[PDB]
Write a protein that binds this ligand. Structure first.
Ligand SMILES: Cc1c(C(=O)C2=C(O)CCCC2=O)ccc2c1c(=O)n(Cc1ccc3ccccc3c1)c(=O)n2C
Ligand SMILES: Cc1c(C(=O)C2=C(O)CCCC2=O)ccc2c1c(=O)n(Cc1ccc3ccccc3c1)c(=O)n2C
Ligand SMILES: [Co+2]
Ligand SMILES: [Co+2]
Lengths: 379, 379
């Protein structure tokens, strides 16, 4: 059941912004690890004396990496005279965020019809304002409200190239890497209490609970009208045999924040071949692969969707498979992206639900918790 | 003239420690960019609840990358019960360093006969203490004094594997990258006033001025007895046509600090081929190459040392060449390693001065300032 209750017009995920200590090194590591190209910059060379921001793209996926310069470079500026290209940026907020949480997502940005209206409707419906709407070069409007922890939901709307003041990156410095990743499928938060977090976000967005279908967590998924913006939220389950990975996150992160980004691939097998080739030479590592048990049990579950060859290809790459009543999900998880056992990445590809493909086809892997436990015990 | 006045027994450069916001991403970027392998770690997986430290090696070159965890993880510890593997580490100092200076070198570490004695003699001769000698597992002694800015000179001495509490990195996570880099040749500081900086450091080390042979700077080089530890120091020259790059450094760095690390290659042509292949796919960029003028003028200067083929190889890779009365220096400079126009890397190879090769053979490139200016003007 989809009541289609969005309180303003939402289009798609627009970008994810990481707050960094050094944007250059994180951006270069991510570019090589995920096969994303450098497409835009805003930094000293573009006249920005406040922050360094570098944009990576793969398909429609946009990752922005931002770090503060010395405040002394901009000490004479005021907000009317700022050289920052993202006017919500604040030196103190960024340093406090990074010192508190380490490397992680500051902003989940969605494109909307009218960012000013989205901001106003959100705050009228309980959203905690973070940065008021500001029009950039009479062309783009950006506004921010609190999502959870120190993560903001950023609204971006375009009258009619990333943001004003960003310059497209020179061809020589823009190598056309591509491992097949094409868009952000969902962005997941960890919170101490699910109930209040859901009530808050659903309260100011009108996002509805996305219909789905004892190991660590409870969760629910909030979704826009066409279910293309998907925001799952997790809470820990305490008192269990193995300590909840949600609680570990909250401890190492100093509270709520973004847990994982799930990146849709147009060919998950090529993406994982390319990413695993680079794991030990600057890229990303992946979670330990499931026992061959798990793949011996895949035939009975998805043998009508994947061939024996396509299944054996899952086993060599460590890919997980789950299934809805509507579609099939192929998924795999990286190890944490930085020093702390906090944020990680999921690579996914969805099979089925053709009409274009409807959002969330095949779910989020709920059935893979039970399947993995059974495999582990029976090994 | 070498008075051999070291006040304690100095061996070689031991390691360089970067203070980071996220050690993982900087270490992975540097590993791929410079061809250094992951060889040791001290982090949560080794019981260290205080800091994450990752060691990269290439030959005898050791780069250590360190970042703080949340202080909450170790809030119950005191120094007698610390889980830190580097007992000089302090959360507040590290966060203050990184917020002030951005990514950069905290420690220039040299191996000595007796770190306790080196510390005592240094402080008795004017060194400002930073961290007193501490014996690690009855096996290694480490001590630190101030060098310039917030950079420390770290003394390490071994009774008889990097440091106690570090674990060697698993073979699967340790890819044997190697682009030919073999050791640290020199480490260079930028200061506002050369005179007082030289008097201070030479005062507590007994290092002597290394004999050498109007564009931005003045400098001098301090050297150990066998001139294998080489510490040049730069100051700005004000009032010039083009603004001094030393002054730009001091402004963007918030004061004195380490300007460049010069890394000796056993085959600079292979190193630069490998590094330039990776510039746009996560590695390091290089300064703009000199005009072909410069290479047209190389024949008259070093045609007795390099063949026409070896010279043309310099031109395609952008390598600079200078010459002493004793030897020849091949050198090239990266663009800044991170967001700020502060620290960068030099790759070098030295030809001549055979006896082993004596330290500093061919100088530091003093003659390349005049040669580059002449080339530029005449283009
Ligand atoms: C992150 C994720 C999802 C996922 O995407 C997701 C959504 O999008 C929204 C709903 C909530 C949710 O979870 C699905 C399945 C997953 C994992 C995962 O992270 N893991 C790794 C793991 C799980 C427990 C652990 C407990 C202790 C120690 C390590 C552990 C590692 C899995 O095994 N499955 C099977
Ligand atoms: C860093 C270095 C060295 C070097 O190693 C070194 C030592 O070890 C100790 C003695 C002091 C010293 O310098 C040698 C030559 C160099 C450079 C360099 O950095 N550069 C790049 C540049 C120079 C001016 C600029 C002025 C304005 C704007 C950009 C500029 C870029 C060079 O051209 N030469 C020719
Ligand atoms: Co997911
Ligand atoms: Co040098």
């Amino acid at each position: 059941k989809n009541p289609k209750s969005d309180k303003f017009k939402v289009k798609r995920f627009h970008h994810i912004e990481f707050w960094c200590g050094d944007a250059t090194n994180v951006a270069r590591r991510f570019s090589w690890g995920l096969g994303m190209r450098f497409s835009a910059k805003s930094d000293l060379s573009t006249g920005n004396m406040v922050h360094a921001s570098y944009l990576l793209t793969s398909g429609d996926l946009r990752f922005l990496f931002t770090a503060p310069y010395s405040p002394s470079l901009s000490a004479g500026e005021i907000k009317p005279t700022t050289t920052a290209s993202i006017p919500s940026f604040d030196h103190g907020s960024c340093r406090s965020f990074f010192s508190s949480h380490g490397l992680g997502v500051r902003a989940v940005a969605i494109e909307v019809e009218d960012a000013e209206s989205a901001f106003s409707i959100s705050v009228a419906n309980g959203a905690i304002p973070s940065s008021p709407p500001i029009v950039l070069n009479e062309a783009v409007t950006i506004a921010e409200v609190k999502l959870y922890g120190d993560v903001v939901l950023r609204y971006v709307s375009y009258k009619a190239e990333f943001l004003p003041g960003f310059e497209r990156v020179e061809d020589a410095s823009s190598f056309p890497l591509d491992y097949g990743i094409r868009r952000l499928d969902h962005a997941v938060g960890n919170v101490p209490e699910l109930g209040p977090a859901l009530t808050y976000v659903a309260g100011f967005t009108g996002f509805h609970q996305f219909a789905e279908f004892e190991s660590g967590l409870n969760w629910a998924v909030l979704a826009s009208n066409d279910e293309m913006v998907l925001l799952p939220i997790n809470e820990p389950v305490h008192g269990t045999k193995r300590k909840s990975q949600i609680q570990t996150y909250l401890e190492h992160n100093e509270g709520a924040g973004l847990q994982h980004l799930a990146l849709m691939s147009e060919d998950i097998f090529r993406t994982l071949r390319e990413m695993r080739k680079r794991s030990s030479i600057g890229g990303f590592d992946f979670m330990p692969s499931p026992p061959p048990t798990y793949y011996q049990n895949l035939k009975k579950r998805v043998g009508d969707v994947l061939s024996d060859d396509q299944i054996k290809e899952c086993e060599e790459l460590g890919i997980l498979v789950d299934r809805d009543d509507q579609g099939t999900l192929l998924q795999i998880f990286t190890k944490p992206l930085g020093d702390r056992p906090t944020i990680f990445i999921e690579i996914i590809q969805r099979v089925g639900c053709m009409m274009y493909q409807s959002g969330g086809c095949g779910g989020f892997g709920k059935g893979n918790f039970s399947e993995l436990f059974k495999s582990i015990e029976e090994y």
